Amino acid sequence: LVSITDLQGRILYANDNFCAVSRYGREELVGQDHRIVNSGYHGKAYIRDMWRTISRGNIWQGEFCNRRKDGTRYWVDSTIVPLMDNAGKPRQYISIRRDITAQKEAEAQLARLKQAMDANSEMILLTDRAGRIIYANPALCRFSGMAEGELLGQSPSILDSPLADQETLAAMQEALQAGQPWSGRLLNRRRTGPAPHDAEDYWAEISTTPIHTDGNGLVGYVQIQHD
């Protein structure tokens, strides 16, 4: 969260949050080069631009991936500000940072998952507790051909033809929100699709399987095959 250094980067101070998250004690920090927490993650130009900005008097802003002691990595979002003389010359440096511990890990994850899901070439969507699409894979969007953003708000029934059997569609929907396994053929419509046009219908074999998460949480995992 907060530290101050002399012009050369030697930590003069060293706040409680900084000690907390760095898992370093204030006495192991004070008098150390701020390089102590460096991680190897950043290239020298990132560091060189930082020092090139602050030493000419300007505020700097950026993220830092830092090293905790036990060698583990954290993230911080920083603003570094110079303190001046007299002769308008930087004399000390104040760094105010929030720990983005955390939101960063919770993000490199999604990217991995998202990356794996996206490569699935089965047509798949995910539904929340209310049976609204929380995710639609590229195979499905491609074949639909609706862009995922058309889709996210909705209802899988947005994929169905106006010709579809309403009583089946409803069975599916009720399975989704209950959440129970369901499957079995619905007439879908795809955009062809400038259009409007539009529009071919085709029988879809459809499976849903509920997935309970923690916190009374529910997702419906949905497969769409051409029957």
Ligand SMILES: Cc1cc2nc3c(=O)[nH]c(=O)nc-3n(C[C@H](O)[C@H](O)[C@H](O)COP(=O)(O)OP(=O)(O)OC[C@@H]3O[C@H](n4cnc5c(N)ncnc54)[C@H](O)[C@@H]3O)c2cc1C
């Ligand atoms: C207030 C304050 C807070 C900082 N917080 C962090 C932090 O949270 N995490 C972190 O990794 N680093 C931080 N630094 C800076 C620092 O230098 C650490 O060493 C950094 O980790 C450097 O890594 P490097 O070994 O890759 O440097 P090197 O890159 O090997 O430095 C060599 C090149 O010339 C440059 N240059 C011009 N003046 C200087 C100077 N005075 N010191 C170093 N290079 C200079 C560029 O640094 C450039 O990289 C902070 C500095 C200040 C002043």
Ligand SMILES: [Cl-]
């Ligand atoms: Cl058939």
